[PDB]
Structure 1
Amino acid sequence: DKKFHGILDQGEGVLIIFDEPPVDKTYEAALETIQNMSKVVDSLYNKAKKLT
């Protein structure tokens, strides 16, 4: 339930605690611009197809 940043081990009986990285933001916004650039080439693709 994300109350806690941890992980457990059955073969060890051991609770392990790690921290949280705020890093994954540049790559997330990177690929969404590629989704927008997919459509503007499609908007140019029929533009050349409708007339050379």
Structure 2
Amino acid sequence: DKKFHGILDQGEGVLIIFDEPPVDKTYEAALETIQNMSKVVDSLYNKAKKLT
């Protein structure tokens, strides 16, 4: 909920920064969709499989 960088230290007491090369969207859209096509194939399974 606030800057996604801060891991801090107890011993020497520092604050490491820039943890992430952040989310580029690519895999998130790709993987997500491939999950859809499942729905569509199941529907086909309605027509083709729940017919024959």
Q: Same fold (TM over 0.5)?
A: yes
Any unmatched runs of 5+ in structure 2?
Answer: none
Following superposition, the deviation at residue 42 of structure 1 comes to 0.3
Q: Encode CA deviations 1:5-50: one digit per residue, 9 max, x unaligned.
A: 3220123312112265244310111111112111011001121233
Q: Which runs of 4+ in 1 moved over 4 A?
A: none
Give the number of equivalent residue pairs.
52
Give TM-score, length-normalised by structure 1.
0.66
> Are the equivalent residues in 1 in contact too, given 2:4–2:19 (CA < 8 A)?
no
Q: Percent identity?
A: 100
- RMSD between superposed Cα atoms in Å: 2.3
Any unmatched runs of 5+ in structure 1?
Answer: none
